[PDB]
Symmetry: C4
Subunit: 33 residues, 4 copies
């Protein structure tokens, strides 16, 4: 269970990196307009 907590924390962090990378690409393509 403490392992499944540690697993979920890393899943949340990763996805937050993923999300903020997707928004960074979106910001990029709109600034080049």
């Amino acid at each position: 269970r403490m392992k499944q907590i540690e697993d979920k924390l890393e899943e949340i962090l990763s996805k937050g990196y993923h999300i903020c990378n997707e928004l960074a690409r979106i910001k990029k393509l709109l600034g080049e307009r």
Copy 2:
């Protein structure tokens, strides 16, 4: 205590998945 925390984490994760779906729809509207 660990169970209350895990439970909330699962819920936070779910919001992230929802955000990624929004971003998928949003990318497509923008052509990307």
Copy 3:
């Protein structure tokens, strides 16, 4: 400390609701284009 954990979990959840509300407005204004 367990209180400050419970406080942070609610801050993360809220902000995730906030974020997904901001993206929902953005999706709305672009679909009406």
Copy 4:
């Protein structure tokens, strides 16, 4: 154990604040 978890939470939170800044810039580019 609580300290490792709190520590990661602070870090997750920070990403959220970064995402909100991206969304602020992105809204403005879109006129909104």
